[PDB]
């Protein structure tokens, strides 16, 4: 049984084509998690891995209401509780976003969270980027594999096998290796993007706007 809440959640989301509805509802309960960092990157840990929660304009506001004196960009070392959250899939550039993998990011959209001030959480292993976990990385690769395999089986047709006479008795025959490259789908650029999961999207605040909005 998976002990890491984040790993189990993010895994079930990916295994269910990024459909937050198909994922078990028994895991949609409040999430109490420690805050490793808060700036320049806000990261929380479920006791095992750290993930970057994306705050909506509503959340950061509601937070300020019941907690005016509380600065979010300073919650480091302090634990927080999320009562209204939703996980959604998003295609990103892993070369810039370190909280993703293979240009795919599973985001934790937080609608509302409370700061459990001074509460002292239990000491656990050193938290790590869930997106650097061997098993979770493989999970995502599986996700892409399925999408890639289906895409190719839909685009490639007619058993257009390389003519054998081209490789048989080819002493005086010379060829360019790029003659073996095959386009997987109709995708625009050189990047494969023929996924079936409906890429969700919700206006989320940049951890920077929450900085100036509290200490310009």
């Amino acid at each position: 049984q998976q002990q890491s809440a984040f790993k189990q959640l993010y895994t079930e989301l990916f295994n269910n084509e990024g459909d937050f509805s198909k994922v078990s509802s028994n895991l949609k309960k409040p999430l109490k998690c420690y805050v490793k960092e808060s700036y320049p990157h806000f990261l929380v840990t479920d006791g095992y891995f750290f993930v970057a929660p994306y705050f909506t304009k509503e959340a950061v506001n509601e937070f300020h209401a019941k907690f005016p004196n509380v600065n979010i960009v300073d919650l480091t070392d302090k634990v927080i509780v999320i009562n209204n959250w939703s996980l959604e899939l998003r295609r990103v550039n892993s070369a810039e976003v370190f909280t993703s993998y293979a240009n795919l990011e599973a985001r934790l959209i937080v609608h509302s969270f409370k700061p459990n001030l001074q509460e002292r959480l239990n000491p656990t292993r050193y938290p790590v980027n869930l997106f650097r976990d061997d098993e979770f990385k493989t999970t995502i690769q599986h996700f892409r594999h399925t999408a890639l395999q289906a895409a190719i089986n839909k685009t490639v047709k007619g058993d257009n096998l390389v003519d054998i006479s081209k490789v048989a008795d080819a002493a005086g025959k010379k060829g360019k290796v790029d003659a073996g490259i095959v386009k997987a789908s109709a995708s625009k650029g050189d990047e494969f993007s023929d996924f079936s999961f409906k890429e969700g999207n919700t206006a989320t605040l940049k951890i920077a706007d929450i900085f100036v909005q509290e200490k310009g």
Binding site: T138, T139, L148, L161, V162, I164, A179
Partner: protein, 460 residues
Amino acid sequence: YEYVELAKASLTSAQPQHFYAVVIDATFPYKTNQERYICSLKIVDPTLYLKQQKGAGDASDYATLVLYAKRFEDLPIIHRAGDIIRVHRATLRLYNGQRQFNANVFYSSSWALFSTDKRSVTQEINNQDAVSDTTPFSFSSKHATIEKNEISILQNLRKWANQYFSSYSVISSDMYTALNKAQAQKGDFDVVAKILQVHELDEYTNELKLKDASGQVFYTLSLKLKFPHVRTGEVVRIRSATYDETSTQKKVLILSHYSNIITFIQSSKLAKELRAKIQDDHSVEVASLKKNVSLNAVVLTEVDKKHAALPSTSLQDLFHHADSDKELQAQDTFRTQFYVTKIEPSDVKEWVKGYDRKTKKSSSLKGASGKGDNIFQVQFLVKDASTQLNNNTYRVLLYTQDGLGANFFNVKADNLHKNADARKKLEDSAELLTKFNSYVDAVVERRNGFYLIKDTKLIY
């Protein structure tokens, strides 16, 4: 410069002392804050290497060297145990019972590494030859000087090391934990196992398949840049690892930025024994082939022994640079790893065609054996780590008409329309080859712009 032996160095002088020593263990240079990097290592010499052998069971005795610096590039990267280090201006003191040499590299101290073996790890990787048996393969500061009177200390200690590493374990049983007990550890521990497999997870990550003397098999992610010396069949010592309680599909070891994977010098008694003792394991693979989705990678093939010592080339170089790269044009044979996304022709029964060696044409056998010589005309649509994100699939063929790769399937070509036993075996292989996490380690020959598999046999 005067060189003192580890056991003869003063404890009360607190004066800068210099010495030569053999590195048997060391953390990786790591950062502790916004200005300091550290590297701690275990050193030995002819006067400090073994403990009171009566009730010690042949345990290793050593000194500890802690090098402090303000820049990563000022600390020694220890890839292999057995090499020699020369330190200048170190302050010795007793730290919890053991001789602890401290050196503030960010001030006046300095170090230098000398390869005990002919070549240093790096030079071995690049196939480079050492400048001389008196040249450091790495040193702090801009300059390093090897006085004539030192050549003896270096040569002698170099000899002592081999005799030492060959006569003792160096890395005694009290220095590492058994993998089958790794789950019982409270925190981090050390490992000494054989690298059964090096799987390229992605552009910057290797996944080592470890197996030690206890028989347990664990996996761990090893960056390519940080540990470019990992080699299959080799034995290594992992400094600081943690059992991953969150991995259910497979036993995993977690490493930290200060963790280090170290190999051993040729004369290593421990390395030699474990290399021959710890044999390959396929239990994980065999078992994973029974599950719908296996989070465990499975290398379905094995290349002929004659190629075992051949560097692999990625599909990226194979299909996008093989015609423009100077070094990739001189060779026609290559080794590569990839996963099959699709197999053509779709109908498995058409895998074996009839081949008329004359018209060079082939045809279906759905109508007797006259069509000609039976051959495998299979076309694989592959992909790999280096091409993971692109919208391409690469063609790799198994055309055995000329004999190349005629046994890849461990099934001699035959009319699959009539031979049920043959067709069935191939249909099974088809399911494995296209299953996620299944891979192929195969050697290929470049023929008229195409890559045909050869000297590669399925092992499942």
